[PDB]
Design a protein around this nucleic acid. Structure first.
Ligand SMILES: COC(=O)[C@@]12OC[C@]34[C@H]([C@@H](O)[C@@H]1O)[C@@]1(C)CC(=O)C(O)=C(C)[C@@H]1C[C@H]3OC(=O)[C@H](OC(=O)/C=C(\C)C(C)C)[C@@H]24
Ligand SMILES: [Cl-]
Ligand SMILES: [Cl-]
Ligand SMILES: [Cl-]
Ligand SMILES: [K+]
Ligand SMILES: [Mg+2]
Ligand SMILES: [Mg+2]
Ligand SMILES: [Mg+2]
Ligand SMILES: [Mg+2]
Ligand SMILES: [Mg+2]
Ligand SMILES: [Mg+2]
Ligand SMILES: [Mg+2]
Ligand SMILES: [Mg+2]
Ligand SMILES: [Mg+2]
Ligand SMILES: [Mg+2]
Ligand SMILES: [Mg+2]
Ligand SMILES: [Mg+2]
Ligand SMILES: [Mg+2]
Ligand SMILES: [Mg+2]
Ligand SMILES: [Mg+2]
Ligand SMILES: [Mg+2]
Ligand SMILES: [Mg+2]
Ligand SMILES: [Mg+2]
Ligand SMILES: [Mg+2]
Ligand SMILES: [Mg+2]
Ligand SMILES: [Mg+2]
Ligand SMILES: [Mg+2]
Ligand SMILES: [Mg+2]
Ligand SMILES: [Mg+2]
Ligand SMILES: [Mg+2]
Ligand SMILES: [Mg+2]
Ligand SMILES: [Mg+2]
Ligand SMILES: [Mg+2]
Ligand SMILES: [Mg+2]
Ligand SMILES: [Mg+2]
Ligand SMILES: [Mg+2]
Ligand SMILES: [Mg+2]
Ligand SMILES: [Mg+2]
Ligand SMILES: [Mg+2]
Ligand code: NA
Ligand code: NA
Ligand code: NA
Ligand code: NA
Ligand code: NA
Ligand code: NA
Ligand code: NA
Ligand code: NA
Ligand code: NA
Ligand code: NA
Ligand code: NA
Ligand code: NA
Ligand code: NA
Ligand code: NA
Ligand code: NA
Ligand code: NA
Ligand code: NA
Ligand code: NA
Ligand SMILES: [Sr+2]
Ligand SMILES: [Sr+2]
Ligand SMILES: [Sr+2]
Ligand SMILES: [Sr+2]
Ligand SMILES: [Sr+2]
Ligand SMILES: [Sr+2]
Ligand SMILES: [Sr+2]
Ligand SMILES: [Sr+2]
Ligand SMILES: [Sr+2]
Ligand SMILES: [Sr+2]
Ligand SMILES: [Sr+2]
Ligand SMILES: [Sr+2]
Ligand SMILES: [Sr+2]
Ligand SMILES: [Sr+2]
Ligand SMILES: [Sr+2]
Ligand SMILES: [Sr+2]
Ligand SMILES: [Sr+2]
Ligand SMILES: [Sr+2]
Ligand SMILES: [Sr+2]
Ligand SMILES: [Sr+2]
Ligand SMILES: [Sr+2]
Ligand SMILES: [Sr+2]
Ligand SMILES: [Sr+2]
Ligand SMILES: [Sr+2]
Ligand SMILES: [Sr+2]
Ligand SMILES: [Sr+2]
Ligand SMILES: [Sr+2]
Ligand SMILES: [Sr+2]
Ligand SMILES: [Sr+2]
Ligand SMILES: [Sr+2]
Ligand SMILES: [Sr+2]
Ligand SMILES: [Sr+2]
Ligand SMILES: [Sr+2]
Ligand SMILES: [Sr+2]
Ligand SMILES: [Sr+2]
Ligand SMILES: [Sr+2]
Ligand SMILES: [Sr+2]
Ligand SMILES: [Sr+2]
Ligand SMILES: [Sr+2]
Ligand SMILES: [Sr+2]
Ligand SMILES: [Sr+2]
Ligand SMILES: [Sr+2]
Lengths: 56, 237, 73
RNA sequence: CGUGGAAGUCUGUUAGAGUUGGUGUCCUACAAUACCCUCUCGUGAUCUAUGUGUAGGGGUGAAAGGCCCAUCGAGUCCGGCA
RNA sequence: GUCGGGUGAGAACCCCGACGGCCUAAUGGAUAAGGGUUCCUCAGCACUGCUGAUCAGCUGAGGGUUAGCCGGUCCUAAGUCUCACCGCAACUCGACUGAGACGAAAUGGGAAACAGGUUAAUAUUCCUGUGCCAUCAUGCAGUGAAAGUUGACGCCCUGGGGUCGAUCACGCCGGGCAUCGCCCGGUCGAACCGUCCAACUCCGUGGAAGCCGUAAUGGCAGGAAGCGGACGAACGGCGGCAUAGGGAAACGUGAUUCAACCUGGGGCCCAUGAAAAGACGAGCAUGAUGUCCGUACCGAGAACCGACACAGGUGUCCAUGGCGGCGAAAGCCAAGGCCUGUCGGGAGCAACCAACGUUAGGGAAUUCGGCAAGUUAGUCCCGUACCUUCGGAAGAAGGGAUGCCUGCUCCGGAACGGAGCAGGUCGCAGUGACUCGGAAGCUCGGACUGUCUAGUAACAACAUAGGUGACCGCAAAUCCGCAAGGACUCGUACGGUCACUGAAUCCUGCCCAGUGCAGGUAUCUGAACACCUCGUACAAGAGGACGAAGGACCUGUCAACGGCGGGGGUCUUAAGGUAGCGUAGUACCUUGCCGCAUCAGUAGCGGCUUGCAUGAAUGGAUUAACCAGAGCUUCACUGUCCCAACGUUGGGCCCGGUGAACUGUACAUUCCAGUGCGGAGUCUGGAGACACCCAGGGGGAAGCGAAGACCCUAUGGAGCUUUACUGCAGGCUGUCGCUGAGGACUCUCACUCCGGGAGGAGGACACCGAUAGCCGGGCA
RNA sequence: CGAGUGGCUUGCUACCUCGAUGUCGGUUCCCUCCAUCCUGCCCGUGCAGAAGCGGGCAAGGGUGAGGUUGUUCGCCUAUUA
RNA sequence: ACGACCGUAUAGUACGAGAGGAACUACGGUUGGUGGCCACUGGUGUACCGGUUGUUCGAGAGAGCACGUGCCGGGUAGCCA
């Protein structure tokens, strides 16, 4: 079986969904954690300094 | 390189864990204050998935249903006594002090009141030899003279299910089934058949170990493979 | 008694199973009566079809040479 | 002689799994691994759905440096960085 | 697909009829996930649709999903999260322990619904009829109430009960066909309420010393058969439900085989086959309440994933429609679906190509190689070698038979089940299509089933049982974590960790010098602290004393890394190749020599064998069985070949419509020679050359495609190794702190562990913090 | 011993190509060279004849089938002008 | 667009002690190559005719499907060796 086109057919699982906190389609319904804002993981909002260039 | 199989083990992942949720009971001795007036009737004889030997279901005088390690010859209806002045019958639990010398014993305790540590596998037994006011010398199944406290409880008789090791597995499938019930990753790929990155014995154009197999005791995990601190190797000499 | 193994496995693999299964499905004496009705139930578990006596013994033998040593003392 | 119906047992495009050869067809494809015939396994160390666990010098590996979302002799993203 | 017709400005592909086809585990029916309005109606053709379109999953506007009893909801599963606690410099980090919560929509558990009707679109939801469950209120009954039962369970074989379906018999209703009288469809009717009970278990009677019983096992004076009885099943029978419903009508009755469903008997495990909520236990009336969320449609060769209306991928239930046959097989055909695996028209339709049929005579001569193709084939009877681990080899091989028709026999209760007999009889052919092994022998490898490089390797590689060695008594060995802690472990040597070899059988020689590991060690060497000397009003510093692990040294060990020669009738460096096997998948020489076989044999096999450089768990030898593994030989077969031909289907060619891409410094009708950075359409000399277009097979453009993987180079990169350099974890060991009383000893009070507790074991050690020495490719 | 011709072998060199001029053997299909194996015409002979040996002119045509080996090469068989 | 070979007569002759053994010439055929042609032999012939298995149209008659003929037998024209 090829890792390409024939392995794409099995992809019917729902993981990333609309988040209650930030509104982005990043709430992993199996992990109960948001990959965008960190909802489910932290009380604080997920922000990182590398999301922008060092001197910006 | 990459961490070896023995290192992946300690992480305690699903593959390396024992199917605990499928295990029946943690076979320990009953906690009596003093006296002897604790006896029970054997209701059933069950199979223990954890040790492949049989386990006896007993109901006590005070109405306690608990599984106990089954010795040889113990059946349904039989009465077993637990306590200090218990009857010296096969299947009864009483401290090593009360048990006479030259009598085969099983489920021996290390520290008095722990519930039994030694001689628990199929058909094995510990031999009680010397008596004192201080020490009770018990000869464990390995042939080692273990000096124990006389207050350590023990069940009389050999463990049931003897001679299991006598008949071969014959086929790989039978091993498969046995191993699916234990805390062991199976099958075993030889290190010599792996890549250099994966094991100290991996690599080469032909399959042979790199350095000698006898490794030092002080070797770090990742290097401690082959013959660990071997006093000698081989059959001859 | 290992004809289910076919032309595979070898002598010792089917000889040590033949001596084990011929002395297992055999008529052995019971501790409660004088009947030879002792049959196997599983690994180490034995039972007599007479007085419903379900007991413990060896894995393939109802009595091991080590279990008979306890009877002495 | 019959009974019995064992088996990592046999035949088998039963369902299902797999993929030996044709170095056939295709090779700006139907398809970033496809088509056809042939071939193998098919009560078991079997196959499978869903749920669940293991995470990057770390997993997982019946071991091929295989696999970890078309990415692996060290994933991906962004940053270090012009 | 075709002929008619419909609508329309317009019709090959939108609709109707007819005729002709396609799909049968799917191309039919119901669904999970996923999609998200794709569903229905009306109006449209600018977009989308492999051509067109009046059509549409497209555009626009409207509309559409109704529940006490179908799911969710509740329960708990692997497991997840939160809180507390502890760790961490710290956290959004981290293991344990507690508490709480979450965790199952087809497909775990679970209170209760069936029949019919209705819409453009919903439907166990609405409507009609009937029924059921739970809670609560009232009334009566009831004092029981929680023990127990259920929920609730593996794999294999099998009996019995039994419905649907299918088929048979016969009767009724309707249709079809028309030499016959055969053929098809229907002949209905639920939930629920009531009732019946086989199996199992048990009781009374009874009194078997050989009987009872089974498909099989089996049962019994510890009481068999027989007789009576208690308990007790179906999604089943029976009655009601039903002068309900449904049907144009009739509106059946018996039977066989019997999925579902019910209930038993047996066997297997170095495998032992969930839990919880809930229900039962524990009555009846009447009335009330029964909220909330899902509900459309697709579910695929156009509604999902794969950029696409993608030949790919994607779970479940229908596995009992008919003939056929062993069959859920082929082939054919219903019910149902479809003509949308969606561009057409034309040319005896050329060459050439893809799939394929048939080829005389020869028969592997083809080729690295029978690659490709073909041969064989189902069933019964006869018959069957070497070898063998006694299982197998084996369907060995080889031989015969095979239809239809008439009338019968046998087995069985019977089948629309099976096995046979006699007579007749047709063909070239009777498993007549379909389905359906080619056979034999020698050798190598791996024992076997199994595993693998998703996407050029399926193999001799991995695994395996078996063999073996190693470590560890559990406060263990081994392993993970920085720590708090953790896996192994609901485990305890018949254990489980770490390695090697790789079934069985016969065996497995010699070497401990080097390296490794381990034990020992008078003596030597061996760090820091403390101690002593010198030094300094102190300190730096220098020396001494003692001396741990380690090393030196000695010993053990090769199924530990590995070794098993040169010379002569010992030498290196310990030994000096034993059984076997041998020109090997290992043999340079080499196509070794002899033999087999062939006309001819670098092949293959046997023998010899001084073996460039075989050899014993770096396992040697051997071997029955197995194999999409490597090599060879024979029989059979054939278009592989001699040597090619004709045919078939789809293309190709012409026409309508749709309509890309690769590539492009320029110029360009070239050819033969030469020249040039030595491989020129373009330079030089000649020759040839009127322009344009169609089809072709690919000689050239050192054709197009990719800043060559080969090679070298760069004070480039990465993965990997080690006795490379330097360091870092880790282990061992000394010392200081915790740390206490009286070079050997006693104690108990810190601290550790065991115990529920009382208390017990241990004990100034261990753990932990710090420092020092050794080992230290485990890692950088 | 001496003098040469070829560019089929091997070697040498590093001119050409590393933003790629696809490998060996084989096959199929086309053209050519002569240093001629056969065929035609010749000269010599240790030329009786027959069969040969050596040489000359000559490239029109021909030069085939098979066994081992991937082989080129070669060894081998039976045919052959 | 033809190349080459074998055979007969020459001839058991010339030659030679014998053994052995020619040529000119004239004929017949074969092989390779070449061009063409289909009366004859052969192949094909999913034109056509027949037989026959399974299933479907009730049987009969007559048909469809079984991969582009279900299979088997025969085979005209044409095209071919
Ligand atoms: C498409 O390939 C080529 O053009 C090559 O030309 C002939 C060639 C080469 C190169 O010239 C060149 O790269 C050599 C002729 C060069 C050379 O020096 C040599 O010694 C050999 C061995 C070449 C033969 C051939 O080799 C190829 O690998 C090499 O082929 C390749 O390198 C690669 C190919 C076909 C693709 C994988 C890219 C050839
Ligand atoms: Cl084991
Ligand atoms: Cl639902
Ligand atoms: Cl039964
Ligand atoms: K090049
Ligand atoms: Mg226990
Ligand atoms: Mg073992
Ligand atoms: Mg497991
Ligand atoms: Mg292994
Ligand atoms: Mg490898
Ligand atoms: Mg390493
Ligand atoms: Mg090996
Ligand atoms: Mg080895
Ligand atoms: Mg999974
Ligand atoms: Mg490798
Ligand atoms: Mg419309
Ligand atoms: Mg509908
Ligand atoms: Mg389509
Ligand atoms: Mg022929
Ligand atoms: Mg073949
Ligand atoms: Mg009869
Ligand atoms: Mg060989
Ligand atoms: Mg194998
Ligand atoms: Mg591959
Ligand atoms: Mg394979
Ligand atoms: Mg082993
Ligand atoms: Mg072992
Ligand atoms: Mg192997
Ligand atoms: Mg040989
Ligand atoms: Mg040895
Ligand atoms: Mg380059
Ligand atoms: Mg390189
Ligand atoms: Mg580097
Ligand atoms: Mg504790
Ligand atoms: Mg390194
Ligand atoms: Mg080229
Ligand atoms: Mg000349
Ligand atoms: Mg010429
Ligand atoms: Mg040839
Ligand atoms: Na028998
Ligand atoms: Na295939
Ligand atoms: Na990484
Ligand atoms: Na169309
Ligand atoms: Na009933
Ligand atoms: Na049938
Ligand atoms: Na198999
Ligand atoms: Na040594
Ligand atoms: Na050797
Ligand atoms: Na296999
Ligand atoms: Na052909
Ligand atoms: Na060209
Ligand atoms: Na690398
Ligand atoms: Na020259
Ligand atoms: Na040269
Ligand atoms: Na070539
Ligand atoms: Na010539
Ligand atoms: Na040859
Ligand atoms: Sr999936
Ligand atoms: Sr979290
Ligand atoms: Sr931040
Ligand atoms: Sr405990
Ligand atoms: Sr315990
Ligand atoms: Sr190695
Ligand atoms: Sr030895
Ligand atoms: Sr291939
Ligand atoms: Sr194609
Ligand atoms: Sr391809
Ligand atoms: Sr083919
Ligand atoms: Sr099979
Ligand atoms: Sr099988
Ligand atoms: Sr950057
Ligand atoms: Sr459907
Ligand atoms: Sr228009
Ligand atoms: Sr529609
Ligand atoms: Sr829940
Ligand atoms: Sr359910
Ligand atoms: Sr099952
Ligand atoms: Sr039945
Ligand atoms: Sr619906
Ligand atoms: Sr599909
Ligand atoms: Sr595929
Ligand atoms: Sr139909
Ligand atoms: Sr279309
Ligand atoms: Sr024919
Ligand atoms: Sr051949
Ligand atoms: Sr035959
Ligand atoms: Sr795979
Ligand atoms: Sr062996
Ligand atoms: Sr040594
Ligand atoms: Sr020798
Ligand atoms: Sr010019
Ligand atoms: Sr072309
Ligand atoms: Sr000549
Ligand atoms: Sr050949
Ligand atoms: Sr060459
Ligand atoms: Sr040679
Ligand atoms: Sr003559
Ligand atoms: Sr003569
Ligand atoms: Sr047809």
């Amino acid at each position: 079986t090829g890792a390409g086109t024939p392995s794409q057919g099995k992809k019917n699982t729902t993981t990333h969904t609309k988040c209650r906190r930030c509104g982005e389609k990043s709430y992993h319904t199996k992990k109960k954690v948001c990959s965008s804002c960190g909802f489910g993981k932290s009380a604080k909002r997920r922000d990182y300094e590398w999301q922008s260039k060092a001197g910006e | 390189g990459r961490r070896i199989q023995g290192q992946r083990r300690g992480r305690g992942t699903s593959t390396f864990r024992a199917p605990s949720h499928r295990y029946k009971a943690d076979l320990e001795h009953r906690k009596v204050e003093d006296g002897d007036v604790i006896a029970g009737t054997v209701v059933d004889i069950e199979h223990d998935p954890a040790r492949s030997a049989p386990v006896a279901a007993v109901e006590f005088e005070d109405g306690d249903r608990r599984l106990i390690l089954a010795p040889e010859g113990v059946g349904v209806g039989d009465e077993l006594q637990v306590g200090v002045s218990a009857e010296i019958a096969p299947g009864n639990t009483l401290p090593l002090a009360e048990i006479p010398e030259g009598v085969p014993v099983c489920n021996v305790e290390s520290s008095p009141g722990d519930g039994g540590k030694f001689a628990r596998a199929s058909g094995v037994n510990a031999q009680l030899l010397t008596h004192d006011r201080n020490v009770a010398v018990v000869k464990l199944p390995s042939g080692e003279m273990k000096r124990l406290d006389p207050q350590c409880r023990a069940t009389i008789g050999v463990v049931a299910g003897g001679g299991r090791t006598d008949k071969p597995f014959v086929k790989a499938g039978n091993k498969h089934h046995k191993m699916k019930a234990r805390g062991t990753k199976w099958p075993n790929v030889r290190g010599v058949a792996m890549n250099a990155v994966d094991h100290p014995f991996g690599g080469g154009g032909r399959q042979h170990p790199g350095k000698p197999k006898s490794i030092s005791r002080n070797a770090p995990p990742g290097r401690k493979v082959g013959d660990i601190a071997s006093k000698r190797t081989g059959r001859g000499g | 008694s290992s004809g289910r193994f076919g032309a595979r496995y070898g002598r010792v693999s089917r000889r040590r199973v033949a001596e084990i299964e011929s002395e297992m499905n055999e008529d052995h004496a019971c501790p409660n009566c004088g009947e030879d009705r002792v049959d196997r139930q599983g690994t180490g578990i034995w039972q007599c079809s007479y007085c419903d006596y379900k007991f413990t013994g060896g894995s393939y033998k109802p009595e091991t040479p080590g279990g008979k040593t306890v009877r002495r003392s």
